[PDB]
Each structure stands twice: as C-alpha cells, then as structure tokens.
A paper describes a structure:
PepT1 belongs to the solute carrier family 15 (SLC15), also known as the proton-coupled oligopeptide transporter (POT) family, which consists of four members in eukaryotes: PepT1 (SLC15A1), PepT2 (SLC15A2), PhT1 (SLC15A4), and PhT2 (SLC15A3). PepT1 and PepT2 are best characterized and mediate the uptake, distribution, and resorption of di- and tripeptides in the body. On a structural level, human PepT1 (HsPepT1) is 708 and human PepT2 (HsPepT2) is 729 amino acids long. Both polypeptides consist of a core transporter unit of predicted 12 transmembrane helices (TMs) of the major facilitator superfamily (MFS) fold and an extracellular immunoglobulin-like domain (ECD) placed between TM9 and TM10.
HsPepT2, on the other hand, has been trapped in a substrate-bound inward-facing partially occluded state. The HsPepT2 model is lacking the first 40 residues at the N terminus and the last 32 C-terminal residues, which are predicted to be disordered. Recombinantly expressed and purified HsPepT2 used for structure determination was stabilized against heat unfolding in the presence of the dipeptide Ala-Phe in a concentration-dependent manner, confirming substrate binding of detergent extracted HsPepT2. The N and C termini of the dipeptide are clamped by electrostatic interactions with N192, N348, E622, R57, and K161, respectively. The phenyl group side chain is accommodated in a hydrophobic pocket formed by Y94, W313, L316, W649, L650, and I653, referred to as the side-chain pocket. Additional intrabundle contacts including Q319 (TM7)–N348 (TM8) and Q316–R322 (TM7)–E674 (TM12) further stabilize the partially occluded inward-facing state. Last, the interbundle salt bridge between R206 (TM5) and D342 (TM8), together with the polar interaction network around H87 involving TM2, TM7, and TM8, tightly seals the central cavity from the extracellular space. These interactions need to be disrupted so that the transporter can cycle back to the outward-facing state observed in HsPepT1.
Residue numbers in the entry: 41 to 697
The structure:
C-alpha cells in the first residue's frame, strides 16, 4: 500500500508549481508590453507580488492550521488559489475595456494567487511527511529529496512552454497574454483534483499550528516585562527569556533558548534571496536588449529562464555524488554550514558577471538621438545624382551630402536642434536645377528625407522614422509607392496593406520571418505578384514600388535597419553561477532548518525560512524604486553588498554549535 500512499502529493506539487512558475514567467513582460508600465514600476510591482506571495500567506497558513487542520486548509486555500488564477486570465483579455480595468482586475488576480501559493506551501510540504511514520527516516529524507526535484520539474516545463504561448498564438492580439495565463490556470484545477483523490488514502492529523504563535507570545511577554520594569539591578537574569520563565514553563523556555541561537543565523540571509529572485524580474529585462536569434530555435526573451530550473536538475545529484565526495576526500570540514557561505559567494560572483555583460550591451548599443538631437537619413529617387545641403536657420550648411540616383546615405547623419522642434532649409541641386526645400524635424527621432522626382524636376518628402525592429523584435516591412496609382497588397493571411499614389508611405507592418517570393498585390488596374527574397529576423526593410515596362510593379529592396550584435547565449554564464549557489544553498539550508530545530519547533524555522525570502524581495523593491542607479552599477551594488553579508554570515556561523 505504501507505493500508492504518497503518489498523489508529489504529482500535486508538480502540477501546482507548474501553474505558479508559468504565470510568473511571463508576468514581467505582461507589465512592460500590455500595461505599458516602465521598468522601475514594472520591477517594483513584480517583486512586491513575490514578497507578498511568501510574507503573509505562510503565517496565515499556519494560523489556518491552528483550528482547521492541514488537509482541509489545502482544499479551501487551493480553491481560492484557482479563483485568483481564473480572474487573472480575464484581466489579460483586451475586450474587458482597456487598461482601466486590466490594471485593477489583474492586481486582484495577483493578490488572490499570492494568497493561495504561500498559503498552501507550508502545509503541503509537511503534509507528505505525515503520510508515513518517520521511522523510515531514509525514506522520509528521500521524499524531501525527490520532492525538491519535483518542484523544479514543474518549473522546467512550465517556464519553457508558457513564454511560447505569449507571442506565438496571437489570437485576439499580437501577443494574446490571456492564453499564457489561462493554461497554467486550468492546470492547477487538475492539481486540486489529483490531490483530492488522496483524501481516501490517509487519516489527516488534527490541527496543531499553535506552535509558531506561542513562541512569538513568549518573546513579546519576555521583552515587554524587561523593558517596562527597568530594575537596573538585574543579574544575568537580564536575559529576556528568563523573564518569561516567571509565567511559561521551564521546558518551553529551554526550547526557545536553543531555538533562538540558531535563528540568529537567519538574520543575514534575506540579502541572498534578493539575488535569486531577481532572475525573472531584472535579467529578463536585460535579455530583451540582447539578440535572440540563434542557429537553434529563436528563443523568446523570458524563455531563457528555463536554464535555472534545468541546471538544478543536473547539479543534483552531481553535487552530492561527485563534488561533495571530492571535497570530503580533501577535507571533511566543508560538509557543514560552510556550504551556505560559499553559496552566497557564487551568487555575489554571478551578478559581477552580469555587470560585465551589461557593460558590453551599452558599448555595442547603436547611436541614438537625444534632446534637441535628431538622426536624419536621405534617400534619392531622382534619375541622376542630387547634391543636398542642409541649410539651417542660421543660413549655414549644417550638413552637405551628394547622393547618386537611387542611393541613400550610408548612415543617419546626426543633427543638433536649437529647440524641441525646428525647420531647416534642405537645399537641393539637380543637373542645372536647384531648390530650397524646408521640412520640420523633432528631437529623439529618426528621419528619412525622400528626394522624389517629377519629370525633370525634383522635390523632397520628409518621412519620420522610429525604432520599430527591436521593440517588436521581429521582421518589419515598409512600402513607398511612387506610382500615380494606389497598390493593394495582400502581405499574408495575417496582414494586408495598400500604399497611396504619388510616393505614398505605409506604416511599419510586422511580418513572419521567411522568404516571400510571390507576395500577391493588386493595383488600381490589374493584379500582380512581387518577389521580396529573404527577410531576416530583427530587421526592418523599406520597399519602393516603381513602374516597369515588363515587370509591371517593380520593387526596390532596402534594409531599413540592421540587427543587434550581442547574442543572448552570453547570458548563460550568469545562470551557471547563480544556480550553482542555489543548489548549494537552498537545498542545504532547507535540510538545516528541518534537522537543527529543537523538538516540535520545526514549524517555527519553516516559517522563518520563508520570511527571509519575503524580506529578501522587499530589498529589491526599495532598491529598484528609490535608488536610481544605472543598471550596470546596480548589479555591482548587489554583488559587493552581498559579499559583505557573506563575511558577516560566515563570521556569525563560525561560532555556532
């Protein structure tokens, strides 16, 4: 009967942690691209939710167990857990009335899901242990060992799958986040059902969750009496717990004294969790700026998180089977609390790499306009070379260029404005002809001056250009119709476009990457097909439609903007380091808490263990909002900040039993 005894719980954890991580994998992007929040506001809310996901709900969970019991609270909390998920999915639906409802509705979904996740976590994990007596200690330890693998197993599939649905389905919108949250949401229902099937297997224990509350009362009772009395003559009885000895039994006081000693080690911990929890919130914001194209399948920005769960699955049992055997062979002193000390080092070292990676992004970043600074390109469609002089408001030649027939300037020549908006007299010369052409310009934007020809005469048409190849991170097309007839274009089954006559300009249209040799299009008179050749990822193309005696519609191909040079693969070293610390810190610390607590006090540390996680994220919240540093500097800040803590932790741990 034992083989079926605990099967349900582990399967429930996999499904349950599948749902949670999948929802939290795309959570950061959902804020940036759907609610249109800025980075600081987007990271703040995300980490607030993660902190709230552990801060209170665990305490509520233990309190719920005080009179309701472990089994029942799982069912009820898991019920509201689903409720928060389904309502969250509704918020992502664009039909629900714009950001006014989405923001308010989503945060309600986030609030409920947070309550459920941390409300069940303290109970479900310990619930499995009670399913069989601890006399099978090795099996009990095995259960927890395999249990932690199951948690990652759910994250692995969920983290890899959910980001795909965020940009692939595009059912109701180009992104369709609703399906991304929906699939995890429905899966949690399966988790609840499977867990419910185990109700007939084991006799659930009665409520006992008064342990955590009682300990807190003793401290409050002890500290208050010492603070108020202020006798001044108190001997070593000054020890606060001795004050509570007046009321509480000696055995309870003795247990708390031993418990308090170990609990000191938890004070410097939360700074470390500020690093691991930053994976999905600030490194994904970094992966956006890096090139995603690869020889393998093109990876989504946040989909890179799959590495962290993946590396945990191979580092375990690799650390236990190999690394720990080697170090113990050279020295056995390391098979102790010192493991956690090194864990803080690697994460601190991991961010140091992130600073190095971040620096290179800025170095490889292309030139950008700025305040009273504008980027201008010039394209010549005249049959012969045209000489162009950019005469500013001072009558001085701000820039001088000469462009042959059907050619463009190699780069967006930068220009400096005297105001946010300004006009410049772009003098033109064509054969013996000359003309002063004036167009308006604005700061912080790209501009393309299209010199157009009318018979032997020429004119110009200023076209505003904006970065539209990295924001969408997908191939984009652009069309100019020099004909005196509008041209209807069926770009694909997902998009269609028409270009106005007389050098009409179309808007940026995103298209699927691939070859398009037979794009169907119809003029005002007859149908036609155009060959565009290959279109690459992350590149924008501008096509000029011209009349041809034989081809009819003749299209000239020009690359509007190239792609980035920094490959996303360069982010792997970060996860290799930080995940190495996690497996060497999270796992060992968890077993340290369960085993080092006094008798029957294990529940207190399990509560304290998650608290330091919650407090850890809040540090990221305040730093991410009220600090104001440059990102490359922030990773350095955490790297050195944690390094100091590691010294404090190691020094503190050195004197522990």
């Amino acid at each position: 009967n034992y083989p079926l005894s605990i099967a349900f719980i582990v399967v429930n954890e996999f499904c349950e942690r599948f749902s949670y991580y999948g929802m939290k994998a795309v959570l950061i992007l959902y804020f940036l691209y759907f609610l249109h929040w800025n980075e600081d506001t987007s990271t703040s809310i995300y980490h607030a939710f993660s902190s709230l996901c552990y801060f209170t709900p665990i305490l509520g969970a233990a309190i719920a167990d005080s009179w309701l019991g472990k089994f029942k609270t799982i069912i009820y909390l898991s019920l509201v857990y689903v409720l928060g998920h389904v309502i969250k999915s509704l918020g992502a639906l664009p039909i629900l009335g714009g950001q006014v409802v989405h923001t308010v509705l989503s945060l309600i979904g986030l609030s409920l899901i947070a309550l459920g996740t941390g409300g069940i976590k303290p109970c479900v994990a310990a619930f499995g242990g009670d399913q069989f007596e601890e006399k099978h200690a090795e099996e009990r330890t095995r259960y927890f060992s395999v249990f932690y693998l199951s948690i990652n197993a759910g994250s692995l599939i969920s983290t890899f799958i959910t980001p795909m649905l965020r940009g692939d389905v595009q059912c109701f919108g180009e992104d369709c986040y609703a399906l991304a949250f929906g699939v995890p949401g429905l899966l949690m229902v399966i988790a609840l059902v499977v867990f419910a099937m185990g109700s007939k297997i084991y006799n659930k224990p009665p409520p006992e969750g008064n342990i955590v509350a009682q300990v807190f009362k003793c401290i409050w009772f002890a500290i208050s009496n010492r603070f108020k009395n202020r006798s001044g003559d108190i001997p070593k009885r000054q020890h606060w717990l001795d004050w509570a000895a007046e009321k509480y039994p000696k055995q309870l006081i003795m247990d708390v004294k031993a418990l308090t000693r170990v609990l000191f080690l938890y004070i410097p911990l939360p700074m470390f969790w500020a690093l691991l929890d930053q994976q999905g919130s600030r490194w994904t914001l970094q992966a956006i700026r890096m090139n995603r194209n690869l020889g393998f399948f093109v990876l989504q920005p946040d989909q890179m998180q799959v590495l962290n769960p993946l590396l945990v699955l191979i580092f375990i049992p690799l650390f236990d089977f190999v690394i720990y055997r080697l170090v113990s062979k050279c020295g056995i002193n390391f098979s102790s609390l010192r493991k956690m000390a090194v864990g803080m080092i690697l994460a601190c070292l991991a961010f140091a790499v992130a600073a190095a990676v971040e620096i290179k992004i800025n170095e490889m970043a292309p030139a950008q306009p700025g305040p009273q600074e504008v980027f201008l390109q010039v394209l010549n469609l005249a049959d012969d070379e045209v000489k162009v002089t950019v005469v500013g408001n001072e009558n001085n030649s701000l820039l001088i260029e000469s462009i042959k027939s059907f050619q463009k300037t190699p780069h967006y020549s930068k220009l400096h404005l005297k105001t946010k908006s300004q006009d410049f007299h772009f003098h033109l010369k064509y054969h013996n002809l000359s003309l002063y052409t004036e167009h308006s310009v604005q700061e912080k934007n790209w501009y393309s001056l299209v010199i157009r020809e009318d018979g032997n005469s020429i004119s110009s048409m200023m076209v505003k250009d904006t970065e539209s190849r990295t924001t969408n991170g997908m191939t984009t097309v652009r069309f100019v119709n020099t004909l005196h007839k509008d041209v209807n274009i069926s770009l694909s089954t997902d998009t269609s476009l028409n270009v106005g006559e007389d050098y009409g300009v179309s808007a940026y249209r995103t298209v699927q990457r691939g070859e398009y040799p037979a794009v169907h299009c119809r003029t005002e008179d007859k149908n036609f097909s155009l060959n565009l050749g290959l279109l690459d990822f992350g590149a924008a193309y501008l096509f000029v439609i011209t009349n041809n005696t034989n081809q009819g519609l003749q299209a000239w191909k020009i690359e509007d903007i190239p792609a980035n040079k920094m490959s996303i693969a360069w982010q792997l070293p970060q996860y290799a380091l930080v995940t190495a610390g996690e497996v060497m810190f999270s796992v060992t610390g968890l077993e340290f808490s369960y085993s080092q607590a006094p008798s029957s006090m294990k529940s207190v540390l399990q509560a304290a263990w998650l608290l330091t996680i919650a407090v850890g994220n809040i540090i990221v919240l305040v730093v991410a909002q009220f600090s104001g540093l440059v990102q490359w500097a922030e990773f350095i800040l955490f790297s050195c900040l944690l390094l100091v803590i590691c010294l404090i932790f190691s020094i503190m741990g050195y004197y522990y039993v």
